[PDB]
Amino acid sequence: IYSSLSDAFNAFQERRKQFGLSNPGTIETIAREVQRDTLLTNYMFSGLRADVTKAFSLAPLFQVSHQFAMGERLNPYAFAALYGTNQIFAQGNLDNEGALSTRFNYRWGDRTITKTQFSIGGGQDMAQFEHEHLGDDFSASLKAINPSFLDGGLTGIFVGDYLQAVTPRLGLGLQAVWQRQGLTQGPDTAISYFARYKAGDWVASAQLQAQGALNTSFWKKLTDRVQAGVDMTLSVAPSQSMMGGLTKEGITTFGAKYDFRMSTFRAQIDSKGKLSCLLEKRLGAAPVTLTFAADVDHVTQQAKLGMSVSIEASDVDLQEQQEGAQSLNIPF
Numbered sequence: 001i002y003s004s005l006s007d008a009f010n011a012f013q014e015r016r017k018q019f020g021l022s023n024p025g026t027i028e029t030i031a032r033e034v035q036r037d038t039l040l041t042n043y044m045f046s047g048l049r050a051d052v053t054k055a056f057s058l059a060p061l062f063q064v065s066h067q068f069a070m071g072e073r074l075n076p077y078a079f080a081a082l083y084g085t086n087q088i089f090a091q092g093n094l095d096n097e098g099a100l101s102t103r104f105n106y107r108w109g110d111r112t113i114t115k116t117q118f119s120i121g122g123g124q125d126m127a128q129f130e131h132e133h134l135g136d137d138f139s140a141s142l143k144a145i146n147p148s149f150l151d152g153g154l155t156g157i158f159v160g161d162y163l164q165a166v167t168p169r170l171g172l173g174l175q176a177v178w179q180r181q182g183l184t185q186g187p188d189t190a191i192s193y194f195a196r197y198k199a200g201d202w203v204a205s206a207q208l209q210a211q212g213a214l215n216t217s218f219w220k221k222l223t224d225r226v227q228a229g230v231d232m233t234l235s236v237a238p239s240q241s242m243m244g245g246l247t248k249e250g251i252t253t254f255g256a257k258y259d260f261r262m263s264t265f266r267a268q269i270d271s272k273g274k275l276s277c278l279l280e281k282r283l284g285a286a287p288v289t290l291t292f293a294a295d296v297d298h299v300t301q302q303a304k305l306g307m308s309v310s311i312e313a314s315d316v317d318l319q320e321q322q323e324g325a326q327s328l329n330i331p332f
Contacts (some may be wrong), residue, residue, distance in 0.1 A: 016137065025139025025195050026069020026132075027173050029162050033203055034229045038255055041266040047277050047293045047306030048072050053080075055312040058320045061085055061330070069095070070305075075303040086329035087113070099123065107331050138164030146177075155180045163194060171196045175209070228256035264291075273299040287312035 012019075029196075031152045034038070048071030056064040067078035078095035084107070091105035103119035103126075113134060126146060133140035147156035156179065163173025175192035190210035191193040197204035202220035209215075216320025217231035229255070238249035262282035269275050275298075280291040288311040295304035314317070 013136075019137060020165060022137045023139070023163060023165045023171055024262065025135055025173065026141065027161055027175060030194075030203075030205060031207065031217075034205065034219045034231050037219070037227065037229055037257055037266070038231065038253065038268060041255070041276070042269065044278055044291070044308075045293060045295050045304075046072050046265075047295050047304035047305055049308075051291075051306070051308035051310075053308070053310040057312065057318060057321060059194040059317065060324050067093075067095070082332075084330045085329065086110075087331060089115075089331040093119070098319055103234060104278060105176075106176070135164065138162065153183060155182055163196075169198050170199070171198070175207075177209075177211075207282055222256065226256060226258050228254075230254050242267075273297060287314055287318070 002102040029036075032295035048122040050068065050070045052066075052068035054066040054068075056066075058064055062081075062083050065079075066082040067075065067080050069075040069078055073095075073244040075095035075097050076096075078093065080091070080093045082089065082091040082105075084090055087107060087110040089105065089107045091103070093101075095101050095102040099122035101121035102120060103117065104116045106115060108114040108116070112113070112290035113132040113298045115130050115132075116128065117130070119125065124237075127144075129142075129144045129147065133142070140143040140160065141157040143157070143161070145159075147154070149155065158178045158180075160176040160178065161173060162176075163171060173194040173196070175194060176189070177192065180187050190212075192210060192212070193206075195206045202218050205217045205219075207215040208325065213234035213236045215233050217229065217233070221227040221301065232250060232252045234250045235247050236249075237245075239245040239247070251271065253268055253270050255266065258265040258267070262284055264278075264280035267276070273295050278291065278293040280289055288309070288314040289309075291308035293304075293306040297303070
């Protein structure tokens with residue numbers, strides 16, 4: 001009986017060669033093929049802050065830093081550090097400016113890749129659990145946010161995603177968002193449709209959240225040092241016919257990477273009225289790096305500027321770590 005399932009599996013494995021190369025199935029990192037380059041850059045667009053980080057690696061397994069945030073986060077001393085072993089990564093973010101907040105990340109497995117990302121704050125505590133379910137050409141992941149329980153019941157966000165290649169270059173996935181907003185509140189759910197078109201000339205991608213709207217993106221490299229991408233976001237929501245809040249809207253952005261040895265550069269067009277630039281430079285004389293950010297509003301012709309400095313302490317362990325850095329099996 002069950003052997004026929006392994007036989008159907010073998011039929012899949014025979015056809016697998018024809019199906020093409022294996023997908024890790026993570027939609028968020030596929031979305032990051034563009035958003036690694038643009039949303040992380042957008043995480044870097046706040047120019048209302050100076051951002052200094054003072055890294056002290058202790059050992060290859062240990063990395064200590066000090067964050068000096070300003071402006072929007074306003075945490076000029078936010079200690080942070082990360083640690084780990086092969087397939088183990090932990091991160092600890094702490095900040096103390098009247099309000100207390102800290103975040104801790106952890107990785108629990110190799111064959112059963114699982115991780116946790118939880119935090120506390122004065123204004124909101126957050127717990128994020130993720131359980132990966134890696135397939136042969138696909139994967140699923142159980143994600144949960146603030147998964148509190150009731151005596152005889154449960155609350156919280158329990159997202160279940162699945163993605164599988166349908167073609168050697170193209171693929172499909174779903175993001176089953178499920179969340180319980182309360183005992184009296186429902187089990188809100190929505191499934192995002194996800195599609196990917198990973199052409200080697202450009203990756204197209206699209207996300208249709210069932211409660212949301214189709215987001216699309218394109219990514220290609222121009223050179224081995226210059227990379228570029230385009231994306232579109234969409235939102236639609238109905239409102240009061242008498243001058244209501246109709247949200248039908250969309251944003252298209254363009255941008256590119258111009259990276260150089262010891263330097264990184266981002267530039268993007270957010271709108272006809274909005275553009276951003278990010279420049280980073282590593283000092284060749286020392287393991288420190290400088291970053292400058294610009295956001296220019298041409299609706300009001302204003303420019304938001306900011307700066308970040310990150311340093312790594314140099315010590316004899318740094319060279320010993322270069323000597324001991326024989327493996328990258330630590331996740332990040």
